[PDB]
Design a binder for this molecule. Structure first.
Ligand SMILES: O=P(O)(O)O[C@@H]1[C@@H](OP(=O)(O)O)[C@H](OP(=O)(O)O)[C@H](O)[C@H](OP(=O)(O)O)[C@H]1OP(=O)(O)O
Ligand SMILES: Nc1ncnc2c1ncn2[C@@H]1O[C@H](COP(=O)(O)OP(=O)(O)OP(=O)(O)O)[C@@H](O)[C@H]1O
Ligand SMILES: [Mg+2]
Ligand SMILES: [Mg+2]
Ligand SMILES: [Zn+2]
Length: 414
């Protein structure tokens, strides 16, 4: 049975909220809505996240790297009881959207920050690892600077964050250890929503560098005096070594997309290992072959069709089920347009999957002891992907509108 005080606030984006259970190693992921959906709509929506996880993302990213635990039902009093308790924990910016309190459904997943031994967990939101290559783009700046580094200017000017991050995803997504070190230092300096650190299921950093060292010193140095620089450097190196870790150097990927350059970004102040999670993530991100500029015309062709034929929306699995036939249709990587709805639709569904891979999080576990990297302790490590719900069909015009603004505003600033 469910107890209000046994669950604690863990985190949120702007689609969902997560609460971790103090005893068992599980979390519950709840949806979020404004004060202004049906119970059935939520059930399918939540079940679509599991189907998409099982039937699409386990193929692209691997069975062991993905965990999308089943949908679960709860009593409506418990959800209310929990909601009010936690309201103070939530940061004030997220509080526009309220918690899913009326449905009584949520998604139960394993807590990737918890599992007598201690545990250190680093969560990263790496963002898009390539600079767009497509001839459909009408701004030449998009071929030079990454989305992330461009986007940074508008976010700081808007007052989202205090200053521009030096993190460029192409530094992290390169194979080069020196570039990967610089990227991780840059995330440590200016965390934003791209870095978080947990110790025994407790957040300890990215919503002070010397305060981090207090917490991390027991791990890497379980007596010699070790300064902050020493502690933070070994965190950077171990993590770099976990991101360069691959268990599948030989096998052929489901997506064999080629990295069309450039591999260095201008805004940033011999490639990834074949089986590593960062490589595999980058491959599913590259399903965006056309760019939004690009893809948006093909969105209109599909919309035009669906407005003519409303019944076919369910028929063509636009909002699921995200099943084996859905997966199979993503494998047509041909970029030659034949003016057909089928072509446009294929590219639209591929673009949504790429959007999902561009906004996903990577959770790295570390525990002192299977799979082990070199360190001044002896650490057993695990890797996971988080935040793999398919991005909606309806947001594609928003991506087109936003992309224009990011590039134009950057082009003004430079
Ligand atoms: O606006 P984008 O493209 O940078 O990405 C959004 C993210 O913005 P960010 O740049 O990471 O601050 C945004 O993150 P924040 O809530 O702004 O931290 C979300 O991840 C959003 O995804 P969803 O629609 O909530 O599932 C993301 O929305 P999508 O565009 O992926 O739908
Ligand atoms: N299984 C899990 N184990 C541990 N922490 C988790 C788990 N799932 C989610 N979290 C935490 O909860 C946070 C919010 O969840 P999540 O990012 O998946 O939702 P979201 O609303 O889709 O966010 P986003 O804005 O990034 O799209 C994560 O950033 C992470 O810190
Ligand atoms: Mg997230
Ligand atoms: Mg999301
Ligand atoms: Zn960059």
């Amino acid at each position: 049975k469910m107890d209000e005080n046994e669950w604690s606030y863990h985190g949120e984006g702007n689609k969902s909220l997560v609460v971790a259970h103090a005893q068992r190693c599980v979390v519950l992921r709840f949806l979020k809505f404004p004060p202004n959906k049906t119970s059935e709509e939520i059930l399918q929506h939540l079940q679509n996240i599991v189907d998409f996880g099982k039937n699409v993302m386990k193929d692209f990213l691997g069975e062991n790297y993905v965990h999308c635990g089943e949908v679960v039902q709860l009593p409506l009093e418990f959800v209310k009881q929990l909601c009010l308790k936690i309201q103070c924990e939530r940061p004030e910016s997220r509080c526009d959207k309220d918690l899913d309190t009326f449905s009584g459904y949520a998604m139960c997943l394993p807590n990737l920050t918890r599992l007598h031994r201690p545990i250190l967990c680093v969560e990263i939101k790496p963002k898009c690892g390539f600079i767009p290559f497509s001839n459909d783009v009408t701004h030449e700046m998009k071929h030079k600077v990454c989305r992330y580094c461009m986007h940074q200017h508008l976010k700081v000017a808007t007052g989202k964050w205090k200053k521009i991050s030096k993190y460029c995803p192409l530094d992290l997504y390169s194979g080069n250890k020196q570039r990967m070190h610089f990227a991780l230092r840059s995330l440590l300096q200016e965390t934003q929503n791209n870095l978080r650190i947990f110790k025994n299921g407790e957040l300890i950093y990215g919503c002070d560098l010397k305060e981090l060292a207090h917490h991390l010193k027991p791990f890497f140095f379980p007596s010699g005096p070790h300064c902050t620089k020493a502690v933070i450097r070994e965190l950077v190196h171990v993590i770099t070594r976990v991101l360069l870790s691959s268990s599948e150097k030989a096998r052929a990927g489901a997506l064999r997309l080629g990295l069309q350059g450039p591999r260095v970004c201008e805004a940033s102040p011999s490639g990834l290992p074949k089986g590593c999670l960062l490589y595999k993530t980058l491959q599913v991100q590259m399903l965006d072959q056309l760019d939004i500029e690009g893809l948006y015309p093909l969105y209109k062709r599909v919309e035009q069709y669906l407005e003519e034929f409303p019944e076919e929306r369910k028929t063509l699995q636009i909002d699921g089920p995200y099943d084996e036939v859905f997966y199979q249709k993503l494998l047509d990587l041909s970029t030659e347009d034949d003016g057909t709805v089928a072509f446009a639709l294929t590219k639209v569904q591929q673009y949504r999957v790429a959007m999902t891979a561009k906004d996903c999080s990577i959770m790295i576990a570390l525990s002192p002891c299977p799979v082990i990297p070199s360190s001044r302790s002896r650490l057993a490590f695990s890797v996971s992907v988080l935040d793999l719900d398919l991005k909606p069909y309806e947001s594609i015009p928003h991506q087109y509108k936003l992309d224009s603004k990011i590039v134009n505003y950057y082009s003004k600033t430079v």
